[PDB]
Amino acid sequence: AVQASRLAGAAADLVPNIFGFAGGGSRWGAIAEATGYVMEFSANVMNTE
Amino acid sequence: DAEKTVLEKSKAGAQSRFDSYGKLYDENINAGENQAMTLRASAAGLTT
């Protein structure tokens, strides 16, 4: 569930969010951040298990 | 003769203790204990 949630937020974040005379605003690192969050969560769940 | 019965039937208890401890020794780690070792060590490999 957390893996799906983080991937969904990452994909939904790359679209630009400011418009008109200034464009872009899409954080390019979001996919690497989501892979980092899910891969550091994995260690905690393996310790619990 | 009754004293003989006392001795040999206490020996049956000593044998049950001896074989039970040997059964715990020869199979020292079961399928669950090493499963935790493998699972714990897999978490150590995510650092890179």
From TrEMBL, chain B:
<protein>
    <submittedName>
        <fullName>TcdA1</fullName>
    </submittedName>
</protein>
